[PDB]
Design a protein around this ligand. Structure first.
Ligand code: MAN
Length: 240
């Protein structure tokens, strides 16, 4: 019952900064298909408060933040999916640099109070322009060496090519290619039966170690997922 999380081979706890190009080089016609692309995209992702959080930033000449991680859209699937359909279009140049600078801020400095250290991910979307900007911009460099991940989709390995018509076809292998880079959290055993009274304590045990994912850049840290003590602890306590 998953696609990019849980048992498949990668963690549910994950933050995403969607960086969408809104320059004049895409046109407004194709931009509508982009919103349709993101709509069905968020439908797939297990977006929850303790699962996947999302953040969307559009950019053209300047940077236009839609909502960060502390936004109610970040934790609700139906809200975010509805919100992406209502995003405006602003012509102009192509400022990917400050766009990645914006995503870096939301992910590493703008996380929800519980999970700052969870695997960060940038899912960018560009056209025929700025093919190298997702490798050139210093922000892209700084994200990867913090345990962050950058994904690129050019229209017209983490680099994916697609056409305007077959946009939705790119979703399936993208989440597949991402799950390789992602780590896997520790496999915890099922909970034990509740103790009598006084208070009531239930316990579980860690089965296998957290499998760290594949590092993004040469000689730079990789996300390593969370142990069972980081998933809620081996023991939970209730009163009676
Ligand atoms: C123990 O805790 C709950 C049971 O209510 C579930 O999240 C799961 O079954 C786990 O093993």
């Amino acid at each position: 019952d998953s696609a990019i999380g849980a048992a498949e081979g990668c963690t549910n706890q994950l933050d995403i900064c969607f960086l969408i190009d809104s320059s004049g080089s895409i046109g407004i016609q194709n931009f509508r298909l982009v919103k349709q692309f993101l709509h069905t995209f968020l439908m797939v992702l297990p977006i929850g408060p303790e699962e996947v959080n999302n953040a969307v930033v559009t950019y053209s000449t300047d940077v236009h933040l839609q909502w960060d991680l502390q936004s109610p859209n970040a934790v609700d699937k139906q809200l975010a999916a509805h919100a992406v359909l209502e995003m405006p279009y602003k012509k102009g140049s192509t400022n990917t640099a400050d766009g990645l600078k914006a995503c870096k801020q939301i992910l590493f400095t703008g996380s929800r109070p519980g999970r700052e250290h969870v695997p960060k991910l940038v899912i960018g979307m560009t056209d025929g322009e700025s093919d190298s900007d997702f490798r050139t911009v210093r922000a892209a460099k700084e994200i990867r060496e913090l345990g962050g991940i950058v994904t690129v989709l050019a229209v017209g390995p983490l680099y994916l090519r697609a056409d305007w018509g077959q946009l939705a076809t790119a979703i399936k292998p993208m989440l597949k290619e991402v799950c390789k880079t992602l780590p896997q959290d520790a496999i915890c055993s099922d909970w034990s039966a509740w103790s009598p009274c006084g208070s009531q304590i239930r316990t579980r045990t860690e089965v296998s170690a957290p499998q760290p994912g594949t590092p993004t850049c040469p000689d730079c840290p990789a996300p390593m997922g969370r142990t069972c003590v980081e998933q809620g602890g081996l023991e939970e306590i209730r009163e009676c």
